[PDB]
Structure formats: structure tokens, C-alpha cells
């Protein structure tokens, strides 16, 4: 029950999608180019990013071509060994600590890049709360190297919450930082990460498919009464005229477009 909604800018940021992972290195063919365009990123990013245009949205574009590049280096024998996922996971993680020697591949760099303008403009805590969930993105490509109530494993490796945080940075606006770790906002953003598991193992947790659309269902129902709790957790955490526009902003263009902007994409 959440409105479908797209960025008025997507047929410029689609048109223009292949200019950056083309000069980073991490398309090289046109072969290469084409399988890009053909996953439809950003479209995808047009929809988790509805309020950004522009410089705003390429990055969400190119956020999205970066991790389904990224994802995809794992699809042979390197996902399939730990020490071997973590020492590519190690060069990008890198990035968040510091400048990359210019020997380190190119997607290592393309990171960079995102990660470069991501924090840019943004709060010190804010950057230093994302680069933790960066953390835990990488973090979870080894945990499932090492495997080879699942939720454990897939809720860090979709990639959700850095796919969330990109919305603050390209609605440029922070949710209070003391409401994003509140126990009400975990619960939503829980959600998010679950729905967004189950809606792509559909598209693995099927080991059945009527019982996910419940589940799906069933926490999206508990995603409205969290909703609905937030003009009192404002009201507990003392947040102002600002915070409180805040929080609304990050309600509506971060965790409901994360939700609905992945259902209409499949």
C-alpha cells in the first residue's frame, strides 16, 4: 500500500548511465555495455530515488551499476572461497579508510568515487554511521563465502541500507540521528531489508512461495502501525520543527521507496 513513484530525471540519468562505470574501468566492451543497460539500474535507481535529479541521481545510478557490478564478481569460484572474497572485500573496504594505492582494481576505485561524493556535504557522524554499514555489506560477501533463518547472512549482503542511506545524501537531509537508532526505526528498516530478501529470492529462501507473499504481507502490515508510531517517537526523542521534517523526508523518500521502488522494478 505504498505509492509507485519514479524520478522526474530518469530518462536523462538512464541515457547517461554508462559515461561513469566506462571511465572508471569497470565496463570495458560493448558487450559488457549492453548486458548493463539490459539490467535496467537505473530505472532501478529512478525508483528508490524519486526525489533526486541530476548530479543526485547519477549517484544513485551509479550506486546501483557499482553493486551489481561488484555482486557480480562473486558469481564464480571467488564467491565461493572465503580468503578469496575477502581479499577483494578488503581492497574496497579500503576506500572508507583512506586514499586507494593506484594499483587497486577497478572496482575498488569505482567505490571510491561513490563513496567520495556520498559523504560529501553530509555530517561526520552521518558518513562515519554509513561507512559502518558499508562495513557490514562487505562483511556479509564473506560470511556467505564461508557458508559455501538465513536472514542473518542476506540482510547484510542486499545491500539495503547503503542502497537507503544513498536517499538521505541524494534527498541531501539527514533522518535525527538518535531516531535512526531508535527501536522503532529498526523495526522499519528491518522490514525493508526482509521484504527486499524475499521479493528477490522470488525473483535462496525457497527450501513455500504462498508463504512469503504472507510474510511479505504480514510485515508489511506491521510496517504501517511502526508508521504510525512516529509522531510519538518524535514526541519522545524532543525532535523540532527540523528534525521532525527530517524524519518525515526519510518516512517517505528512503524507506518506503527502498520498499516499493524494488517490487516495481521486478
Given amino acids: 500500500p505504498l505509492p509507485g513513484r519514479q524520478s522526474p530525471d530518469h530518462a536523462r540519468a538512464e541515457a547517461e548511465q554508462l559515461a561513469w562505470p566506462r571511465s572508471l574501468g569497470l565496463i570495458r566492451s560493448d558487450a559488457a ?13 529512478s525508483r528508490f530515488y524519486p526525489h533526486a535529479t ?4 547519477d ?3 551509479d550506486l546501483m551499476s557499482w553493486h551489481f557490478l561488484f555482486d557480480d564478481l562473486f558469481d564464480g569460484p571467488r564467491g565461493e572461497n572465503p580468503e578469496d572474497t575477502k581479499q577483494l572485500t578488503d581492497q574496497v573496504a579500503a576506500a572508507l579508510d583512506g586514499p586507494l594505492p593506484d594499483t587497486a582494481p577497478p572496482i575498488a576505485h569505482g567505490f ?6 556520498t ?9 562515519a554511521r554509513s561507512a559502518r554499514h558499508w ?3 562487505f562483511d556479509g560477501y564473506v560470511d556467505e563465502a564461508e557458508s559455501r533463518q538465513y536472514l542473518a547472512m542476506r540482510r547484510h549482503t542486499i545491500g539495503v541500507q547503503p542502497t537507503v542511506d544513498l536517499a538521505e545524501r541524494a534527498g541531501r537531509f539527514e533522518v535525527p540521528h538518535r531516531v535512526f537508532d531508535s527501536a522503532v ?3 522499519m528498516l528491518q522490514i525493508a531489508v526482509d521484504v527486499n530478501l524475499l521479493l528477490n529470492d522470488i525473483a535462496n529462501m525457497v527450501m513455500s512461495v504462498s508463504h512469503m507473499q504472507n510474510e511479505v504481507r504480514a510485515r508489511l502490515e506491521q510496517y504501517l502501525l511502526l508508521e504510525s508510531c512516529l509522531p510519538k517517537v518524535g514526541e519522545i526523542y524532543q525532535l523540532d520543527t527540523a528534525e521532525r521534517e527530517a524524519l518525515e523526508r526519510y518516512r517517505t523518500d528512503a524507506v518506503r521507496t527502498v520498499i516499493r521502488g524494488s517490487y516495481d522494478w521486478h
Avoid: F, K, Q
Fill in 33 to 45: 555495455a549492453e548486458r548493463h543497460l539490459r539490467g535496467g539500474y537505473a530505472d532501478l535507481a
Fill in 54 to 57: 541530476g548530479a543526485d541521481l
Fill in 59 to 61: 549517484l544513485g545510478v
Fill in 112 to 117: 571510491a568515487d561513490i563513496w567520495r561524493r
Fill in 119 to 127: 559523504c560529501e556535504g553530509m555530517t561526520p557522524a552521518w558518513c
Fill in 135 to 137: 562495513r557490514n555489506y
Fill in 185 to 187: 526505526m529498526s523495526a
